[PDB]
Symmetry: D2
Subunit: 726 residues, 4 copies
């Protein structure tokens, strides 16, 4: 026995707040959390306690510390079959990462609709409010490798596998409502442009390099999703606090055969929230696993990620009623024109057991639809349908990837396909072809119908010649970027200007910067001028005279495009740092922890060393991390309770911790003699909105802090932060 006698090696199998217990595989942390898919994986879960160590052939091993050798200082012998199996398996551990979205984090959960949608769709998972569909969801960045950092500036993926009773449906979306390009033929060009450059394989996780901006300057259709990327949408706080979108128009098909166009939305019930760029960039260094960690720890705490599925629905007869093409995936459908109808709720409530087996090997593909859905001719969706099956057979080693446990349907699947590498299913059917008489033609085709029917495509009319040509209706590139720009708050605009300015400053060939600023002048002259000033570029008179693009169907703005213009804050699952001293005022700590607990906000107790400190009343406080070990970047607000403030008053790291949190617009709360830290961040005696201060930490102090936290950041401080050296 190498475990400690006290049992402290094993985390409690109950919900616990971040940092309170070591994290664990999902089935051991939350063994009572079940759904049909989770249960179905029991055939392949493998335990360990009380079992002997063996080879993969079942032979017990006596000595797992040594190779077999001729004498104990002799050569290793070829007959050591136990060493060679162990080292061969290790030698073959890695598989290819995904070509894009290689970096991602996943969890299990469940979905149910609010009401039956049978009037618009015959899909079975949308038919009954009390029929629950398991899901597995992977969130991702796009450009970086599987070992890249989480809080980069990038688009994020949001892929949901729904294990329905009529097949797997994969809704493979991103966190912005449009993509960069119009036709899948260009996907390798765009991805190669954004990815590390091919001579030296730099930069990882960043679009701030010449080839990406070269492509953008030469392909104005990219500008819309570039605007989203350069805004704070490119730097979410958490995968719990971003939107999701399917991007393409799809179809819903009901039992009477009617097609309705649909775009898919996920609304985060925790609200929309993003980092600021200096925080995000520094956090890729202090904790490159911040989003993976925060997601796993939110589910271990019971702060399950919840999202509302929503549909924008457009009747068939209204296909051409907008000033943009519904099938153009560089155009969004403004919610002021077509509202999102609430459809159902998805809750992620258990982490996987083994990241490689369940997350790395999962395969999501947007051609996996079910009866009641269909595609459209969007030319980027069309080409996606070829790529996901093709790449998943390369990455997962052959055509039986649907038999890898995470990807298996929970509903029946039977057909005449056979063989392939690592075939697990042993078919007993005498026939491997149809039509057959020798098995009375089973398994059999099923006619389409209202429920449980075979799939039939909606009989869309196709009229045209065989052409490689872009629809002229797709040839407008600046109106949607402008609508997005005008819908942002002033601080969000400033952050967009700063994102383009920072990125193009890293473009070494100056003419590319100039060409991008010329594109920006076709969107908005105020944006283009503000970027140009930061680049040392002066717009020409012709640039100053470019006519702005038209409004989008009369809209001058749509506030649903902003992260912050409409309040939607939720503090449950956020975290505060509490900076301890060696004689903390216990009464402050009581009041602080009670008010945080009432709102579901977690706390991390920090100090200048690890171990414990004792409060004024004898209470022994364990320290979660040092001020340098868990920087302000990792929390949403900072509280300094009273005590022996002289202990930490001259500590550089405690002072910096407040300066960094202040620069990054976080609420700060100072009780009693902790108000002496007002001098590090230059707060006048009268106080400042976003700094909470009082003689002690009481009801009123904590309510004011929590109100600031519900607004996420203190935007009004922005003019005060350029002078702080942090």
């Amino acid at each position: 026995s190498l475990a400690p006698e006290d049992g402290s090696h094993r985390p409690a199998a109950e919900p616990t707040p971040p940092g309170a217990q070591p994290t664990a595989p999902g089935s051991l942390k939350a063994p009572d959390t079940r759904n049909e898919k989770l249960n179905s994986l029991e055939d392949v879960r493998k335990g360990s306690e009380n079992y002997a160590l063996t080879t993969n052939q079942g032979v017990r091993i006596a000595d797992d510390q040594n190779s077999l050798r001729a004498g104990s200082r002799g050569p290793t012998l070829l007959e050591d079959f136990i060493l060679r199996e162990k080292i061969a398996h290790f030698d073959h551990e890695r598989i290819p990462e995904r070509i894009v979205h290689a970096r991602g984090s996943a969890a299990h959960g469940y979905f149910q609709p609010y009401k039956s949608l049978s009037d618009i769709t015959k899909a079975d998972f949308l038919s009954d409010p009390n029929k629950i569909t398991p899901v597995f969801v992977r969130f991702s960045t796009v450009q970086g490798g599987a070992g890249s950092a989480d809080t980069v500036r990038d688009i994020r993926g949001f892929a949901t596998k729904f294990y329905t009773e009529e097949g797997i449906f994969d809704l493979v979306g991103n966190n912005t409502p449009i993509f960069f390009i119009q036709d899948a033929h260009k996907f390798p060009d765009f991805v190669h442009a954004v990815k590390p450059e091919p001579h030296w394989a730099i930069p990882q996780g960043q679009s701030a390099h010449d080839t990406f901006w070269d492509y953008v300057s030469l392909q104005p259709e990219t500008l819309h999703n570039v605007m989203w990327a350069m805004s704070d949408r490119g730097i979410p706080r958490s995968y719990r606090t971003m939107e999701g979108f399917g991007i393409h128009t799809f179809r819903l098909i009901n039992a009477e055969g009617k097609a309705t166009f649909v775009r898919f939305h996920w609304k985060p019930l925790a609200g929309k929230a993003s980092l600021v760029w200096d925080e995000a960039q520094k956090l890729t260094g202090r904790d490159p696993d911040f989003h993976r960690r925060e997601l796993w720890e939110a589910i271990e705490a019971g702060d399950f990620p919840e999202y509302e599925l929503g549909f924008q629905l457009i009747p068939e007869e209204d296909e051409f009623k907008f000033d943009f093409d519904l099938l153009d995936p560089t155009k969004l459908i403004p919610e002021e024109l077509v509202p999102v109808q609430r459809v159902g709720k998805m809750v992620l409530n258990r982490n996987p057991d083994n990241f490689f087996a369940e997350n790395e090997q999962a395969a999501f593909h947007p051609g996996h639809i079910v009866p009641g859905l269909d595609f459209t001719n969007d030319p980027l969706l069309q080409g996606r349908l070829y790529s996901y099956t093709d790449t998943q057979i390369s990455r997962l080693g052959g055509p039986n990837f649907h038999e890898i446990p995470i990807n298996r349907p929970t509903c029946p699947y039977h057909n005449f396909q056979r063989d392939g590498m690592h075939r697990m299913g042993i078919d007993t059917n005498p026939a491997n072809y149809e039509p057959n008489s020798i098995n009375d033609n089973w398994p059999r085709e099923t006619p389409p119908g209202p429920k449980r029917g075979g799939f039939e495509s909606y009989q869309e009319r196709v009229e045209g010649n065989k052409v490689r040509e872009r629809s002229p209706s797709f040839g407008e590139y600046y109106s949607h970027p402008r609508l997005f720009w005008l819908s942002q708050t002033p601080f969000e605009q400033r952050h967009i200007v700063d994102g383009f300015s920072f990125e193009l400053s890293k473009v070494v060939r100056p003419y590319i910067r100039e060409r991008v600023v010329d594109q920006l002048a076709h969107i908005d002259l105020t944006l283009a001028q503000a970027v140009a000033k930061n680049l040392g570029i002066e717009l020409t008179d012709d640039q100053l005279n470019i006519t702005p693009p038209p409004d989008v169907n009369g809209l001058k703005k749509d506030p649903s495009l902003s992260l912050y213009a409409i309040p939607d804050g939720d503090v449950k699952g956020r975290v505060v740092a509490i900076l301890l001293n060696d004689e903390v005022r216990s009464a402050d700590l009581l009041a602080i922890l009670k008010a945080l607990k009432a709102k579901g906000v977690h706390a991390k107790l920090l100090y200048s060393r690890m171990g414990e400190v004792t409060a004024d009343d004898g209470t022994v406080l364990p320290i979660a991390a040092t001020f340098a070990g868990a920087p302000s970047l990792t929390v949403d607000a900072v509280i300094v309770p009273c005590g022996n403030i002289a202990d930490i008053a001259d500590n550089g790291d405690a002072n910096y911790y407040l300066m960094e949190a202040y620069k990054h617009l976080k609420p700060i709360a100072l009780a009693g003699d902790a108000r002496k830290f007002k001098a590090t961040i230059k707060i006048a005696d009268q106080g400042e909105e976003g700094i909470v201060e009082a003689d002690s930490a009481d009801g009123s102090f904590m309510d004011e802090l929590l109100t600031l936290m519900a607004a996420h950041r203190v935007w009004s401080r922005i003019p005060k932060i350029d002078k702080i050296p942090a």
Copy 2:
């Protein structure tokens, strides 16, 4: 419904003789047959009846006859995900075949020992006569591809996977007691020499070409196994009528630590039986699947392949008591010197359900041993230990090939190995390393002991310098080929000579045939001269004067080396052709069938067309095949009953049937006017040994025939067959 109304599409789920029903997947044919391994596969067996046809994602298919197109004469659309999945799976069905032994045929069964062998081995599967161990056995040729023919001249593999309670043990043997080469380093050279030549990839399934005999002529260590391959051992009648051998000396280790050297044997309880060359060669054309078919039909009829495991046991202190090295795999241990001790019985009693999932994907490797067994320094075994794991991860797609269902142990297996392509097991252990405290060090090592202990290698002494050198004790190449030659009957020796003469005739470079005749002259002069005569080569005076090699430990023959010197016939499961006419005498047929039934001998009723014929007394006789359709090659004897003989007397195919059977030494029985056929095979009026004849088919006509079948072939006919034009 496409099945016929009378149900005649479905084979009866009970034992039936070959030809009486269509063959079927083993769990449908014999649902009541079970063992622990067959039970454990049930979780991956897939049915078919009454299920809908789906994609692999579980979506029901409505039209499995057509691609999606724009108009019914239009182009196929990329959005047809059901076509693309079905075609992608088909496109990736094949996996690499095995480098050697690619052609092979397998079945499930069980093994039990006759008594506990605990005094000599602590192997669990040999510890208790009530302990039943499931097996899976694959028999194979060596040189040809998976789609080559079965009845070629080649060595045969005989590989047994024992699913024990202490691990998988794979006994990976062949049907001769030695191999061609001494050191594994030469295996690619020898296999490249026997395989199809590299410019043009000819010939398939044949050693009769220049490179093979070039190698043989230059590597006299090969001559021992070459003698076996050129004997009728190279052309077995069935996998059920051949011996098996582990070849190498291995060790048994008992609970007290004592090592005993062992060589493994399988004794066919159906007896030893081979074809003759002209019959085998022609049968590769008439039925290239003959041995696969015979094995599967024997198991469907209940003629289960049975084999007795036996051990030759040599004490450690007798290592050097022989004229040859125990560790040299080109030497056999004569049974006259060290008897085979009977160990237990293996019965093969169920066919697979799916050939590719269970046969093609099975992986046997001789390094898979269990506590109670160990290796020796045989330098061909030593290098095998590297090859099998290496090649199986290449062929089966990654390091998780033990999770393919046929390969999985039935006993527990738990370790710290993770990931790899196709990973099925989902580990819940918090640790993936040891030593660990975080899971209290589980799964844990187990010390060696008398049962259920960890594996520990026997502490053999090693002393010598690091050298690439053959042991001088291995440098004797001719004594064991001579012992084999002298142990054969005179007709077995004729067929050896004819095997070398035919194969060397197909070597285009004459000097290679001369060099191989020179090697034969070092084994035995009568052999050498008889082959030389057939090649037009004259021995030199010096060749006529080479001194024969020494006897082996005083032996000038060992009759256990001969197929036929000691009768071990068994007629059960053999087959007779019955040549019908349009008015058969029914009393003849009743007697024939009743006597054959009583000895478990099958029959096939042949005619000049399919359908039925009617007997003298009105009995309707169903025809199994035409004369041309089921040639004499495929049966053990031929019976022609009386009746309207004029119906078939001038039928070329019926006369030819008897001439082929006659040439190949098969018993032939002629009743009543069927005696007219004596003229086509030139039999005298007074008869000859091997031709049974009488006014009717009984009293003793069937006993006489069945006695001839017990002796397999009519060797005394040999001098008569050269005159027959067949």
Copy 3:
């Protein structure tokens, strides 16, 4: 005419200091720097300028901007073999990364001995001071993926392929003179313990987690290389300013058959230098490619990495 008319898109083919010009493929930046290995690769180098765009089967492409569809707003057709080949190649670009040392940066160069070592070794590449051996060198971290950060705290790999006249010799070393473990049987245990933990796959590029220190606390043989990793050896300023070591004792064999034990070293002629931890950890965020970049730009500037 997408290039600027002033030609400022193309870097000068002469040594230039970091940042002065866009970086480029070696054969375009320094066409006149040659060695026998670099010359032998000319058979497979592919240019681009002035050539038509083609499929991999050599068919010229007319419109690389659009898929073939029935009507310009219609469905994409299966017959579009140009789109299918281009997206099939893209779909299969990635190969598995190295199980360890997945993150690395490499360059070409050459080796010459100072004098003949025929007295102690018959290795042909050490037999003559005028015999130049081309090399290719890869420097690496150990634990993180290929897309992890360069200035982590970790051991570094220093692998040199010598293309000799009597065969390839690979000297596969690290930047500290010992390893963490004694017997290869334990290498999957130790690597599993330092790698991201298996439930959640955290942390990347760091040994600062429970399983690593669990293994170290139970296997005191690891403490010597742990000391080196916790020192500033674990955070080099550049691959140019660290030492290299083969770690193991090997043998040299001379023509007379005498064996001498040897351990191999590389001394950085630019000196030894390391970062400090707060700087290295921050730099993993501000520039995760800092060591790859610095090596590439040192070579483009003429500040060639040299090692003895």
Copy 4:
């Protein structure tokens, strides 16, 4: 791609074109060709957009599909003319 080990099967010597072939496709298992293009995407400025598209024409032109007229609904249906 399954049978020959990856997407560079056209680099296996028997399958190589004898005419020029140049494009922006990169990587894949057993990649033989070492591309020197600064660009691996188009449109690009950094290599003056090379290698470049070629319009269709009477000789040495790029490939353009014959502009067949397609009219019909999306159906899984066999032409009656094939019955």
